[PDB]
Amino acid sequence: DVYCEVCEFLVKEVTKLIDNNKTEKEILDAFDKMCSKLPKSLSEECQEVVDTYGSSILSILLEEVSPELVCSMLHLCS
């Protein structure tokens, strides 16, 4: 309800990049600018999530697992 919020944030943003035809390389690189979207309170936690979870989020999304389930699958939400 903290690492969960940043996790829901990232999932959506990555599925936007998926829906806009970004290669996987391009999304890994778009992780640095993603946490810029957020206020400073959250940024640090955000970069903690990108660092351990980012590419695992992307891969699961790329397996066609529902965006909805990603964060709880990874034990960041729920």
- Can you give the CATH number for the domain in which 71 is found? 1.10.225.10
Query: What's at 1, amino acid-wise?
Result: D
- State the total domains in the chain: 1
Residue 38 CB neighbours (<10 A): 16
d(CA 56, CA 4): 15
Question: What is the full DSSP assignment across 14-31?
Answer: HHHHHHTT--HHHHHHHH
Rg of the chain in Å (alpha carbons): 11
Residue appearing with tokens 């035809």: 21
Parent domain of 20: 1-78
Tokens of 17: 């990049």
Q: Please, how many CA atoms are within 13 Å of residue 64, restricted to the half-sphere of its CB?
A: 0
How was this structure obtained? X-ray
Tokens of 61: 């999304």
